[PDB]
Design an enzyme around this catalytic site. Structure first.
Site, PDB file in Angstrom:
ATOM      1  N   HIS A  89      34.419  62.789  62.167  1.00 55.02           N
ATOM      2  CA  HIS A  89      33.137  62.120  62.336  1.00 55.02           C
ATOM      3  C   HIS A  89      33.294  60.662  61.916  1.00 55.02           C
ATOM      4  O   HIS A  89      34.375  60.215  61.524  1.00 55.02           O
ATOM      5  CB  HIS A  89      32.009  62.823  61.555  1.00 55.02           C
ATOM      6  CG  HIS A  89      32.192  62.839  60.065  1.00 55.02           C
ATOM      7  ND1 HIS A  89      31.285  63.439  59.216  1.00 55.02           N
ATOM      8  CD2 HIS A  89      33.172  62.343  59.274  1.00 55.02           C
ATOM      9  CE1 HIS A  89      31.697  63.308  57.967  1.00 55.02           C
ATOM     10  NE2 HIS A  89      32.838  62.646  57.975  1.00 55.02           N
TER      11      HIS A  89
ATOM     12  N   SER B 298      37.010  65.075  58.146  1.00 55.82           N
ATOM     13  CA  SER B 298      36.881  63.662  57.782  1.00 55.82           C
ATOM     14  C   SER B 298      38.252  63.176  57.322  1.00 55.82           C
ATOM     15  O   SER B 298      39.230  63.388  58.049  1.00 55.82           O
ATOM     16  CB  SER B 298      35.758  63.536  56.766  1.00 55.82           C
ATOM     17  OG  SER B 298      34.589  64.155  57.270  1.00 55.82           O
ATOM     18  N   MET B 299      38.363  62.525  56.160  1.00 52.25           N
ATOM     19  CA  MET B 299      39.660  62.021  55.722  1.00 52.25           C
ATOM     20  C   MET B 299      40.729  63.103  55.781  1.00 52.25           C
ATOM     21  O   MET B 299      41.907  62.803  56.008  1.00 52.25           O
ATOM     22  CB  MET B 299      39.575  61.468  54.297  1.00 52.25           C
ATOM     23  CG  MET B 299      39.110  60.038  54.208  1.00 52.25           C
ATOM     24  SD  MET B 299      40.079  58.852  55.176  1.00 52.25           S
ATOM     25  CE  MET B 299      41.771  59.386  54.898  1.00 52.25           C
TER      26      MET B 299
ATOM     27  N   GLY C  35      36.462  62.930  51.804  1.00 51.17           N
ATOM     28  CA  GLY C  35      36.092  62.232  50.588  1.00 51.17           C
ATOM     29  C   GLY C  35      36.221  60.722  50.761  1.00 51.17           C
ATOM     30  O   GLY C  35      35.832  60.161  51.793  1.00 51.17           O
TER      31      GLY C  35
ATOM     32  N   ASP D 216      29.329  64.784  64.068  1.00 48.50           N
ATOM     33  CA  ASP D 216      30.339  65.762  63.694  1.00 48.50           C
ATOM     34  C   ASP D 216      30.878  66.447  64.944  1.00 48.50           C
ATOM     35  O   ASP D 216      30.108  66.924  65.786  1.00 48.50           O
ATOM     36  CB  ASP D 216      29.762  66.813  62.747  1.00 48.50           C
ATOM     37  CG  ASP D 216      29.341  66.240  61.419  1.00 48.50           C
ATOM     38  OD1 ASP D 216      29.878  65.188  61.019  1.00 48.50           O
ATOM     39  OD2 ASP D 216      28.469  66.850  60.768  1.00 48.50           O
TER      40      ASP D 216
END
Lengths: 182, 182, 184, 183, 183, 182, 182
Positions: free
Chosen positions: A112, A87-88, A58, A161
């Site tokens: 990513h 991600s985060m 996010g 990714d």
């Protein structure tokens, strides 16, 4: 709604120094985590804290309030990925206390490069394009630090990714150990 | 979901004199902060108050209600930026007690000039155009005061979006110190 | 949600014991009536001690505002008003209506006064009735400002023809408020 | 969220026999008023009840449930208009206990004839058209009773929307007294 | 929002007094609350009467039938009072109150008509449902006939179109027993 | 309306160590189960846990957080399917403690291969196609393990939706016993 | 608003062992009934349980979780139809304890064959067509058992919607007795 034990189940597990980070990272759920990290520090600044992560990622700013709070507070914050950490979510996972970053056998982790967007004047696009490349630079540095990889490797591996199994993530330095049975 | 400790997590941290300003600034969330500042002043007009800020900005009138309350009350209002403090968020951060304005290593701060819009008669456009140019001057004057910068520098640097790191914000005067570890 | 305080009040209920009432956002029947109820309750609790009404509002319904305005005058306690953020349209009138000498704002508050807004559709005969009603509301509202500010009636009518923004100092010079508070 | 001083603010004023009628009149808010009138009667069938009205009107049937409950119960139900009392709002105000119907200086009151609409077969239109003309007559009779005006004057003045000031409404019989400062 | 009495909400407070309110359109969930309140009151005291206030425009026949049949099934007499309006299922539920204990207030409006429905699909399926609603029409008329004392054919005729009734008219019809005016 | 017993009905059944998994599998309801599983382990790490399942499936990552938590914790987690257990739901059912996997006479269970989707650049499509093919293999390995079937049979029988009755599911190894009366 | 008695009205009737099933049958309202049935069994596995039904039907799987729980538990579960019991609602009514399945004089009961729908590949259509024909068979067997009719009669009588009065439902075996007055 959330079942009760008058505690809800999550308030009951908060006494055990357990915090859950579930779903998309956004300002409001992120600040709940910050508040719990700060509260637990005050309850006992020496006892470890365990942050369970099942998130696809996010907001970069929202995550950074979590990441910086984890490092800032005195207690060590362990991180355990259940389900997924992308991600985060993966950056927060890598950011846990050294040697105390875990996942479970079928967890999926993905890293990513940052995503963003803007519209307006070319001059303003330039400002925001430079801001996103700087954010990309800074986030890669955090990964490099916690994994031990060179920044240039992180930048290359995150260009697209890149999904990782538990074993792969340990080889990478993203986590320390794959837990199986207690 | 707000967890409980019988206090919820934020009511529990309110006793430690911690207030959170999260998300877009608007009349209702802005007024909660005002009420928390007044309550803490009444609880103890001497002990400091700590305002954590993770906001992208929002309403100037809503933000000024927060800003003017911070200065008005007797206790010093420290400000700490976690995540981001942009537009009105950065002004509230810069407006914290002298020497007690902080951020964390990966916080992002951004300053720019005011935004607005209107439609109607040319005579009415003139009135509102003059009002926003008046706010633009007043806000630049507030930044100059708290950062120590000359007014013409503030006007220049805020013409377009200008992002700042923690170190940059200290050199600018926007904050006093980058906190890293407690 | 709205945070909590022990001896167990939420923050606004806790400040209500201190006789502080907040009016935030667009004026409409339901939020306006909450203010009325708080004004009435505080009167019964103590008809002599002052009451403090904080205002951060862009305006709203004239009737909803009038229920607040008339309740302020009707009850025995003096109702001080302090503008934080902004006080525009009905918000500015409610601010101007505070107890004499006890109408304040903070250094960067913005206040705006203008003439009433309305609309109608239907038969010419019905349009005539409502056009006369809004012209009547305009007259009476200007008279309320004139009374509380000390201005001539025709001046208020002149100054409210278009949107008129005012700083704290301007509002004091104008009579809209009494004093700009800075530090306690 | 209604503040807490342990009562909510309206529950705290409900002990003081004050009931608020705010906004558009509709079955659910109307029945709450009915419930409050009955409860207060049970608490004390002799003490007056104070009904504040700040309403633009609404459903006649929902309003009539309030009107008839006001008369049915033993206590006198005073009415005070704050803000506005238009259409069914004005009728509930006029229907308060004699001599105990008030407003504040800037209250606005509006009386008019009933509004309605229907669609379907001509035969059904006739049935419902007759129903609204009956409601119009009955409502004029309710006003005439409480204001003291002749029925034909009510019919005349309600043909179109008619707004009234506090002083005008006293002169008309819609309310008894314009309150200014408490006693 | 529902005010509190001390800690009761206003409606739970009147539920102790054996009063139940039926407000608005009839549908499964609001209908079952009434059923449950009726069952609870029977358990608290199977001899004391129950008072059901009705302000409803009608609604689902099946939902209304759960109320009607529960009213008859339980031992206590279920008094019914119409405030505001009682139309369609609302009027049937009102007529279904204990004999001699079916009331309204002076300005209540009651309306009776025939059932409404709709269906689409195969002719065979249309036939099945057309007969089902005609059966419902017959059965509902028989309930009205029973409680009012009117012959079945009169009910069928009077319900062909919307038929509005005043309190006096409803008493003459057998729909209610008495128009209450003042306590 | 959740009825009350000072418990809501589910909090009261949580004391008897019963957890319900109802409806589509997604992060938030999945994490509720994880929290209840962890809570019950802490109250008593030896007594069995009974997980009722009425689910058509849902998110694989969310389900795996449930699956891995079931195995990780000390207690044996019994599973009982009521109504249906399809896709991720059937995997969670098969994943229960050996010999303690049940259903009721009219329960429906369905197994198939993973579903997914993606749009974007061909290179990115390639990454995610390999990732879903990896999940497909791993999930077949989990079914093979718990059912006792050879891996090639699971692949064959899961190519399309395959519905199973209670008796069929026992013969298959998906569950251990069809319960009828207590 | 559910009024309160400190029990809400439905929690108060739960102590008297009464459960209400209102409206469309779906997983969440269905599982509440399951939960209440299990709780009442634990409170007392010998005392009867009374299930009131006012429902037009709904999900077959959700309804089956209710039906199988009624049979599985020790206490007899009486069923009373008020208003209507159609489709799955009528099956749950018929599924009540023998001799203790009631309705009220103007209740309407309707039985028909299951409805479904699917889109996709012909091969996938074949799989699901067979599954709904199997569900149709299994549900007809349930009625045949509880009503005493031969299955072929049930299949024929459910080909189209078939509405039933109280008297009709008793001769058919769907219910045992029409209650009128206590």
């Amino acid at each position: 709604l959330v079942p009760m034990v008058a505690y809800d189940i999550y308030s009951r597990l908060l006494k055990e120094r357990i915090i859950f980070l579930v779903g998309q990272v956004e300002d409001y759920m992120a600040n709940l985590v910050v508040a719990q990290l700060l509260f637990l520090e005050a309850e006992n600044p020496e006892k470890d804290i365990h942050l369970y992560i099942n998130s696809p990622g996010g907001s970069v700013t929202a995550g950074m309030s979590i990441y910086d709070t984890m490092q800032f507070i005195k207690p060590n914050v362990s991180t355990t990925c259940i389900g997924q950490a992308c991600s985060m979510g993966a950056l927060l996972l890598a950011g846990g206390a050294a040697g105390k970053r875990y996942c479970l056998p079928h967890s999926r982790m993905m890293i990513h490069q940052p995503l963003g967007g803007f519209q307006g004047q070319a001059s303003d696009i330039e400002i925001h394009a430079k801001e996103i490349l700087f954010i990309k630079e800074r986030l890669n540095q955090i990964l490099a630090h916690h994994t031990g990889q060179p920044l240039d490797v992180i930048a290359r591996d995150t260009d697209r990714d890149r999904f990782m199994s538990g074993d792969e993530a340990v080889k990478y330095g993203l986590i320390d150990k794959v837990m199986t049975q207690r």
